[PDB]
Subunit: 237 residues, 6 copies
Amino acid sequence: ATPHINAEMGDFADVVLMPGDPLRAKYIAETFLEDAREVNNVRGMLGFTGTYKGRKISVMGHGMGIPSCSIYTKELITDFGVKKIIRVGSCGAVLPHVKLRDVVIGMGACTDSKVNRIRFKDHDFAAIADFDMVRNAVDAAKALGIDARVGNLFSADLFYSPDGEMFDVMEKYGILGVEMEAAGIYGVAAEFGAKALTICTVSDHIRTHEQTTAAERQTTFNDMIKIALESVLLGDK
Amino acid sequence: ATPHINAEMGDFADVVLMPGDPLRAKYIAETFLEDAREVNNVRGMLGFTGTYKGRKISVMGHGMGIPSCSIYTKELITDFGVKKIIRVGSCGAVLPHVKLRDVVIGMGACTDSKVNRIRFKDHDFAAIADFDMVRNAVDAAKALGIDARVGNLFSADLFYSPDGEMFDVMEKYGILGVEMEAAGIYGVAAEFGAKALTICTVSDHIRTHEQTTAAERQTTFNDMIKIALESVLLGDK
Amino acid sequence: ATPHINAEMGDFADVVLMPGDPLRAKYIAETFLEDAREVNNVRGMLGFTGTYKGRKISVMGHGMGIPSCSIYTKELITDFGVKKIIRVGSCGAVLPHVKLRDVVIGMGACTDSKVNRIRFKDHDFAAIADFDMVRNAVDAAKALGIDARVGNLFSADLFYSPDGEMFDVMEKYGILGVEMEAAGIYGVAAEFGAKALTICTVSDHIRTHEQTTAAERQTTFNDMIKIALESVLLGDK
Amino acid sequence: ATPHINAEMGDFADVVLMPGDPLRAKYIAETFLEDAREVNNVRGMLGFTGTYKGRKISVMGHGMGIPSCSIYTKELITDFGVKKIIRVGSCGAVLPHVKLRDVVIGMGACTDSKVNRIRFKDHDFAAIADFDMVRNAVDAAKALGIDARVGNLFSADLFYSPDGEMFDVMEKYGILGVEMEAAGIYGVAAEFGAKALTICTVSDHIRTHEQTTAAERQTTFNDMIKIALESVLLGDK
Amino acid sequence: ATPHINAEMGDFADVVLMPGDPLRAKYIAETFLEDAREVNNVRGMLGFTGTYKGRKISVMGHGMGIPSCSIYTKELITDFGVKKIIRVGSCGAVLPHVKLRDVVIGMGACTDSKVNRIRFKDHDFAAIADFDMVRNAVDAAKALGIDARVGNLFSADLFYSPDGEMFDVMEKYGILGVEMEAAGIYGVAAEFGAKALTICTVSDHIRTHEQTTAAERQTTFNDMIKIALESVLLGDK
Amino acid sequence: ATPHINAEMGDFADVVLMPGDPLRAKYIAETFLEDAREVNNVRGMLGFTGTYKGRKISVMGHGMGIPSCSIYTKELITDFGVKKIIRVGSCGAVLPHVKLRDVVIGMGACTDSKVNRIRFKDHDFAAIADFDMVRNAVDAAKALGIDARVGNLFSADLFYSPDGEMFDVMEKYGILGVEMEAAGIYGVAAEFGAKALTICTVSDHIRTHEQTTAAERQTTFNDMIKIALESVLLGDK
Ligand SMILES: Nc1nc(F)nc2c1ncn2[C@@H]1O[C@H](CO)[C@@H](O)[C@H]1O
Ligand SMILES: Nc1nc(F)nc2c1ncn2[C@@H]1O[C@H](CO)[C@@H](O)[C@H]1O
Ligand SMILES: Nc1nc(F)nc2c1ncn2[C@@H]1O[C@H](CO)[C@@H](O)[C@H]1O
Ligand SMILES: Nc1nc(F)nc2c1ncn2[C@@H]1O[C@H](CO)[C@@H](O)[C@H]1O
Ligand SMILES: Nc1nc(F)nc2c1ncn2[C@@H]1O[C@H](CO)[C@@H](O)[C@H]1O
Ligand SMILES: Nc1nc(F)nc2c1ncn2[C@@H]1O[C@H](CO)[C@@H](O)[C@H]1O
């Protein structure tokens, strides 16, 4: 156990799915995992372990922001033997052709955080996902009949930015979605030698501001999780 | 309601105590406030409003990290009429003459985050607390007979730092405690026009590695809470 | 005609292979392309256009360094309708398990240049390749019975850097090879909306010099070109 | 004697008031101290030691700019046993509700200088004053019936700034006065182990351009001097 | 032999003239040198050594960009005993009074590259030429009845920069010409203890395109070479 | 008049010599100028105007540090019509072959200040002197039988550096002397379109710490001033 996770080696599977919202972790465990059990409750960051189609899988929230998810991912890798981390979240879109409910896979993640510069002697470290994990997720999506865009995400430190100037810049350079953790998780994976991937569903757009129908948004969220879980099986082969 | 808080104007007091842990907020509400009622549960970030010695007061968690707390403090200030924010957290000590459970008051907060440079044209913004609030806290501590040091805190983005040599630099410059939110809350208070103060309880020592348990951090740090609450009453007069 | 390319729209195929050594352009045209014709000679940067199994392909050198390749890739994209750029070069390795003559594919590229910060308002831009192109190269190599590693490349501005301490850092973060252009080409692709990929063969293993015969190098180089060319055909399917 | 001060241990009191102007130091010595004697003249940087209400006190100029005052404050602390430094200078106002001759107390000091980043591994060091000294100054002002605001100052390297837009940023973040030494004195106090405080008299307004004459700045800023001297006595008790 | 120069100590004179366009090396050898012999052909970078009025001189191209020229200049200095490097190139002008075909001499060179900061611990290194070489070039030009301007050059990493606002800044600070190598060569000279100078002829006037005949350019180029060569003889006296 | 100079247009010559010490300005006026008169006394920064061999010349101190001299040089150029500024100071040596009493001429000046980055959009501005002024000073020195080294100076913000690490770096890159103003004055000259030059005499060495005989040091200082004054006459021709 650590100050943030009251569990022991063995309590987590070697693969952990991670949503930002701890309440979303309980939702995922209840909906897709069989014979699941709660393995952490410290600070209310619920974690669960169960099986998917016979495969042992864990799911736990990571909180909002690079600093928060950096703590949890590091501990899972160095204290609980986790090999793969799959972040499952939401993002905002800036590109005109990326629409609501689009499933985005971040092969890379830009950021305005200073954490990777501190790690990489003030130079440019390209925060990327594990290639095989990206491939497995793209393949799982095809199998489910889902289209998925693979590209760059942007991990922001400030949800409420003082200068809405970076949005035009992100759009200019092709960023697919704006979130707050990918670059941090990729930095941790590289520093401690594990593999990671971030998958997101477009929750809102920079330009047009119009939702759809709850039922439809919730269907897309479940598709993302199915893509995540099915990508793991593909990787096991 | 705001993107991360499901409440309406009036649900929160004009002053809010904020620990990083939602579970500590719950404990504070049950132990120190009368007629306490839960006003928020989104993402599990519990918020409560009650009364202390007849004074209306709220207490809500803010999560770990500058990005997380920047979201909550901003929303409270712009949509719920919150005028004062008093962070009541934990921190790690670097100085040899500082021990577990000591209370520290951050008149200033250093940081390795980029958020303030983004707000201040890449220059050095001195993230400081509100003077009157600091004085109120000092007076309240003396009245309660509790010791408390006033000085600089260091708000880190990485709990697990890639270079421990920086701890030597922090020590040399007299940093009283290492935490992860102060500089962010102060930057937000200045940007959106409110007042803030951070009070911390030393929960661990970075050099000796002596630690307090998560349970202890969640329900046993009473001194700082007493100082915080009594300091508000002093401010009202 | 552009400042550095004396040709007209239509002279280049929509896909261009680019080696660092200009002398390699003529070799590739004569050895792998059919009905090749010369399309550029400015500053000695010889360019050729022909076909590979019916597919129109072009080849032209880019010169050493990010500044040089940035000029050529930009002009090809904005003035000659080029949609895909495939850099075929060499690199030095820092990892023990990465051996001489190995073929590496840069899904991403780190760097110590300031070009991307100039583009990305001094923030961290993850210079990445086009995912489909990466997957095409991997599948083409497999079909040719060649094993290739997919990961991060490091694009250095100084072949002779003042301090080798950075090589230790590169090794710690999993960099597969050290070269001098990838991060620059990826930046151009993002800025002008095109696709790019860098494939490299390990020609030296910094801090560990082994031996190879001119015939072995000939073989490995030809392997890299066949992988690149077959990858394009896969992308067309 | 030190490189810039021709005196011996004992010549200076353990507390020294320091204006940027040597001529103001002379005026302070002749107007407020009894039995005042000149102890330094090197480079024209006049220093004096006398008594105030029986209390031994010194007053010496420090010159304009962080580099200049860093030299003098360091030498006093390391070779003359000086424990407290109280800067009594002038500043320019940026806020509309601030007028000429208003007194300001810098609890913190922002800056565009690189000196603190050089000391703090390129991170954000919050240059703050000694809390007790700030409180002493506030109490002394109230006792004298003089108004005084407590807040952030901005220490500039360029009196004639290349970009006036930064003044808008300073105003937005509530900077009370623009001067050129505070952040430097605070950095020195922390590095060499002493305590410091900066008190300023608004001598001009950056927006309205209203100005005070050089003669006025040299011999008419009495309020801040009274607060400074009386604050020391308070500290002794 | 070095990685990029297949030759031995003694093959190059202690003074080397370097154009950016490799094709210019053979032209200079045939047109101005006596008894010239080929000494390099690696990667197509042709090098020649001969004599000018009895003085041993060498000529070889350096390629476009700081990274490229940094490789060649370094190897020449550390492995072939070269003591002086004279870059003979072209540049674009931003100042009104600087006209097409003008000859400019870079006593100093500004830059947006990070190479010198990497060398100078992230501080400002003034990349300058050797004073005597500058004075020799000025006197040689005068003797040839040619007027030359001596000032700052700007070495750009991106020929196609994302924002032309910097050209206004360059104009304001007196930059005479924009090119892509000077600052890099000067850095190498300082790092390995050698002497360097960059002479350029204005080939374009950014934001103001005029006209010139191929014969006029031929003349101006020959003028620059004669100035460079005669400058060496002056330096020997 | 300005807040720093109580004089009027005409009071200063179009050429001003500037030592750091205001007392040195009186020494220079008294020793080399005829019919001189004091033209400024504000803050004790004495300025004088007289003639040298019939030529009208001024001399005034600039204080220690870039921020201080930046104020005075700017005002002289924009408010008093000064065309040339010649700083005459002292410096510390780092190179083994640069000995005490050597006369150094800074054709360029490195720095750890941020002032030129603020001016030059965060890029590298090469702070250089006016070529003709450097040439005139070298010529005047020859005429007086004095040897003078021309090269780079380093302008430090901290006389008492926290990291004596930069000294080896300066030596590594050939810096001739360490002082505190050159880079700032060159920045002002460029920003407001005037000409400047810095000449220094070696007052101390980094390695060997041994003086000579006052009479000898004072002879060298006067030689520097004679070089300065005689360089002006040469320029008038
Ligand atoms: N438009 C958006 N902008 C930012 F900055 N973050 C977004 C957005 N949409 C969703 N997120 C994700 O949800 C959380 C913040 O509400 C964070 O966890 C974040 O990853
Ligand atoms: N040693 C420590 N280092 C850092 F960076 N933060 C610390 C430490 N001890 C306690 N904290 C505070 O508690 C949370 C992390 O457990 C964060 O919310 C943080 O503010
Ligand atoms: N070890 C190496 N280090 C660096 F910096 N670049 C390398 C290395 N091996 C090959 N290259 C590639 O060949 C050229 C430089 O010789 C450049 O074009 C570059 O991409
Ligand atoms: N508007 C102003 N801007 C700046 F930068 N400094 C100011 C201003 N007014 C007064 N000062 C203070 O007085 C001196 C400069 O006259 C410096 O010593 C400085 O601290
Ligand atoms: N206007 C110009 N802008 C830039 F950036 N470089 C210029 C220009 N004119 C000529 N050059 C010189 O020629 C090459 C680039 O075409 C490089 O070798 C460079 O030194
Ligand atoms: N060794 C030295 N180091 C530094 F930083 N400055 C030096 C040195 N010797 C002389 N100076 C010059 O004299 C003043 C500082 O005493 C400043 O005005 C400065 O220019």
